Amino acid sequence: GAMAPSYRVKRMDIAKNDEECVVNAANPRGLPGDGVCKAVYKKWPESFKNSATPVGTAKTVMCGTYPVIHAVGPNFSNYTESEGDRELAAAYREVAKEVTRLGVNSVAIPLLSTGVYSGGKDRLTQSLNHLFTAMDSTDADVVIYCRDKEWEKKISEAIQMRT
Numbered sequence: 001g002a003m004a005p006s007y008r009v010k011r012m013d014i015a016k017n018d019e020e021c022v023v024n025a026a027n028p029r030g031l032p033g034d035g036v037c038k039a040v041y042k043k044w045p046e047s048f049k050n051s052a053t054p055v056g057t058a059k060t061v062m063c064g065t066y067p068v069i070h071a072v073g074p075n076f077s078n079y080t081e082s083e084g085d086r087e088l089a090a091a092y093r094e095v096a097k098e099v100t101r102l103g104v105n106s107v108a109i110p111l112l113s114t115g116v117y118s119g120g121k122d123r124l125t126q127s128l129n130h131l132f133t134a135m136d137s138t139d140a141d142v143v144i145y146c147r148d149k150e151w152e153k154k155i156s157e158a159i160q161m162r163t
């Protein structure tokens, strides 16, 4: 585990992360996909061998020795708010289990079920809180990756509030 387990947020490409493993915002089919998923495919294509896994689950595939945790959030275009919220909480719990199993000291993570899977809604607070509920019991340094300046400020604030 990390010496003083922390949360941080960085506004850059998660494919350039400085952590011991990465969470992919995967699709259920293990396809190259778009957004974070496409950057992950371009950086760690080997990790997409038998990566396909259902909604609300996480499946780790090693690129060399570097773990890629394919976390499948619900697409809110397809799910009801109620069922989406449940599968989004589940995907984060499976990430916590895989990060623990791997014994890594740090993990790079995007906010699941945002952008292409948000159903056109701002789910920053929803997704971030399910991230906290899962990862709070873990001892890994968590680094959250986003691309939009207003998202970084809001994520930074939510982290610092609890400190």
Ligand SMILES: [Cl-]
Pocket (backbone or CB within 6 Å): 011, 012, 013, 016
């Ligand atoms: Cl970048």
